[PDB]
Each structure stands twice: as structure tokens, then as C-alpha cells.
Write a protein that binds this ligand. Structure first.
Ligand code: XYP
Ligand code: XYP
Ligand code: XYP
Ligand code: XYP
Ligand code: CA
Ligand code: CA
Ligand code: CA
Ligand code: ZN
Ligand code: ZN
Ligand code: ZN
Length: 316
């Protein structure tokens, strides 16, 4: 819509107050004009018709429980934008300032959120498995990273390629969570998963075995479910990414940590330059060793740490 850019105030899913960019035209719409071609949040109104109605508010205040999923979807979409722009100099997910559109209140009791190829889609959860998933910045950035992947490497969503595809979204989903720097960690979905249970999450990058996911190539899932365990085998790469950043000893392999910033630089360059739709774990290693060589030199510590981390998880 066409209106005056305004700044509203509201509370997200977890009750945290935050400002959001709005557009005023009789009503205050969730339309952020300060980022690329805009960020738009829509109300699906408990139906599956997308995108729905552009979220309108009467007083520019978003403190109602019904607003909370829209606030976080709108706000965190902007944080993800600020991350890729400021850190990797990428304008939106496509690199050409494409508009980031999101729909909340999708269906009823929907325990999922996903990028549909054109926009984000956030369900409200059932209240026991999930609360509104937009409340998890890592989930938001996770799914928005799938768009970046599609507009670059195009990794398929099956077998090892899909595990990489999932690991890329967990890595940058976690890096965006650190970029926001409110309650960062190396878990996924902890903020919205099982509200009645504390200290758990969907999966752990620091210790994938915590939830039965593999932390080594020899333990990779080989079945047919989950498109070949894309969410399961991703732990092997998540463990590698965690070791590259924070370092540590794993299966007797010592890894020197180089930090989160370089981890993002190494993996962002590997995704945008060297990965192909059918990249496997071994080719990802080569993609990360080449990226670190470009950025820091073949003899640099960063290249060594990358090799160490993939050696630790058994990816040669
Ligand atoms: O999971 C924890 C990790 O986040 C921290 O960085 O180091 C100790 C681990 O227990
Ligand atoms: O110790 C882990 C256990 O907590 C989990 O239930 O299943 C996988 C094991 O590695
Ligand atoms: O043979 C593998 C070993 O090299 C590694 O250290 O841990 C897992 C084993 O399967
Ligand atoms: O069965 C596949 C396995 O061979 C590969 O190693 O990782 C993905 C699985 O789907
Ligand atoms: Ca209001
Ligand atoms: Ca997290
Ligand atoms: Ca929980
Ligand atoms: Zn994913
Ligand atoms: Zn967190
Ligand atoms: Zn998923």
C-alpha cells in the first residue's frame, strides 16, 4: 500500500516488546519500507489461502495476543535482512532486494513454518508441541536461508544434499540469532518448542547426540523417511560448524575455534560460489576448505580448523 512510513510498538510471541516499521494509510499496515522492496506481513485468518490480507492495525499498537505472531514474523524478517546485508552484503534473499512477505495465523494448530518458494508461512502451533513459530528468530532465519540457498546453490532437499541444505539453514539461523544477540545459543527452535518443557529444542548443533542425531559420518541415517534424514544427518554438519567456531575435541580430533563471524564468512562463500544442487558431505568439505583458502590463505589457521572439524565428524 501507499502511505507514510511510521514506527509502531508491540509485543512478540514471548512477550518481548519491540518496535516495528509500519505504513500508515487510514490503518497502520505491517509494511516495512526501510528494507529493499519492503517487508510485508499478512493475516491468513486461520485459513490456508495465501498470502491473505495485509495486516492492518487501528492504533499502531501491537500488544494483543493475536498480534504477537505477526510482530515477530515482521520484526525478525527485518533482522534476517539486516544480517545478510550488513554481514555478507546480500540484499534480501535473492540479492536484488526482493520483498520478504510472511503470513501468520496460517491454518489452525499448525506445528510448522516454511518458505514456500515465494513467501514465509507461520503456523500458530498447537500450544503444547509449538507456540507460534515466528517467535523463534532461528526458525525465521532458518527458513529464509532456504530462499538464499535456492537462489544460489539450489541444493536438493534429499539425501546428503538436503542434509547440507538443512545445515546451512541451521548455521545461518543460529548466526542470525547471535547477530540479534538477545539469548543466542547453538540449539534450534528452543524459544518456541514445547513451552511446558525447559532446556530442550528441536536439535543441538553443539551435541546432536543429545536428541539422537548423528555427530559423525559413520552414524548417518540411511533410511527413506524425512527425505533421507535431512533433519537428522544435518547434525553431522552442524557439529562441524560448531567445532569450527567454538573449537573442541571430538572423537579424539582436536579443533581450534576461529569464531562465529569467520564461520559465517566461510559457509556463505561456500554456498554462493562452490556448492551445486547435488553437493555431498565430501564436496561441502572441499567447498569450505576452498572458501577459507580464498578468504585467509591455504596455510591459515582457518583452513586448518575447517579440515579438523570435518575430520572430527568423519567427513573426508
Ligand atoms: O552446549 C554448550 C555450548 O552452547 C557452549 O558453547 O559450550 C558448552 C556446551 O555445553
Ligand atoms: O544419550 C542419548 C539419549 O539421551 C537419547 O534419548 O537417544 C540418543 C542417545 O545418544
Ligand atoms: O571408524 C570410525 C572412527 O574412525 C571414528 O573415530 O569414530 C567412528 C568410527 O566409525
Ligand atoms: O541413504 C542415504 C545415505 O546413503 C547417505 O549417506 O546420506 C543420505 C541418505 O539418505
Ligand atoms: Ca492495535
Ligand atoms: Ca537457537
Ligand atoms: Ca521447550
Ligand atoms: Zn529447513
Ligand atoms: Zn536462543
Ligand atoms: Zn525443516
Amino acid at each position: 500500500i501507499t502511505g507514510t512510513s511510521t514506527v509502531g510498538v508491540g509485543r512478540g510471541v514471548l512477550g518481548d516488546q519491540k518496535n516495528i516499521n509500519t505504513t500508515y494509510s487510514t490503518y497502520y499496515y505491517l509494511q516495512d519500507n526501510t528494507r529493499g522492496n519492503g517487508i510485508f506481513t499478512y493475516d491468513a485468518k486461520y485459513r490456508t489461502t495465501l498470502p491473505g490480507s495485509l495486516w492492518a492495525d487501528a492504533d499502531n499498537q501491537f500488544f494483543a495476543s493475536y498480534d504477537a505472531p505477526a510482530v515477530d514474523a515482521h520484526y525478525y524478517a527485518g533482522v534476517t535482512y539486516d544480517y545478510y546485508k550488513n554481514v555478507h552484503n546480500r540484499l534480501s534473499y535473492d540479492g536484488n532486494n526482493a520483498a520478504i512477505r510472511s503470513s501468520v495465523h496460517y491454518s489452525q494448530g499448525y506445528n510448522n513454518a516454511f518458505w514456500n518458494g515465494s513467501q514465509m508461512v507461520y503456523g500458530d502451533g498447537d500450544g503444547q508441541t509449538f507456540i507460534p513459530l515466528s517467535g523463534g528468530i532461528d526458525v525465521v532465519a532458518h527458513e529464509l536461508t532456504h530462499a538464499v540457498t535456492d537462489y544460489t546453490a539450489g541444493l536438493i532437499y534429499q539425501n546428503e544434499s538436503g542434509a547440507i541444505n538443512e545445515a546451512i539453514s541451521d548455521i545461518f539461523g543460529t548466526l542470525v540469532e547471535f547477530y540479534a544477540n538477545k539469548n543466542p545459543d547453538w540449539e534450534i527452535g528452543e524459544d518456541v518448542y514445547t513451552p511446558g518443557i525447559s532446556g530442550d529444542s528441536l536439535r543441538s548443533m553443539s551435541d546432536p547426540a543429545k536428541y539422537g542425531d548423528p555427530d559423525h559420518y559413520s552414524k548417518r541415517y540411511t533410511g527413506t523417511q524425512d527425505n533421507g534424514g535431512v533433519h537428522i544427518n544435518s547434525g553431522i554438519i552442524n557439529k562441524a560448524a560448531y567445532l569450527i567456531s567454538q573449537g573442541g575435541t571430538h572423537y579424539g580430533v582436536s579443533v581450534v575455534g576461529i569464531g562465529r563471524d569467520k564461520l559465517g564468512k566461510i559457509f556463505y562463500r561456500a554456498l554462493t560460489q562452490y556448492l551445486t544442487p547435488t553437493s555431498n558431505f565430501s564436496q561441502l568439505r572441499a567447498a569450505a576448505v576452498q572458501s577459507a583458502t580464498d578468504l585467509y590463505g591455504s596455510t591459515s589457521q582457518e583452513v586448518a580448523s575447517v579440515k579438523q572439524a570435518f575430520d572430527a565428524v568423519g567427513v573426508k
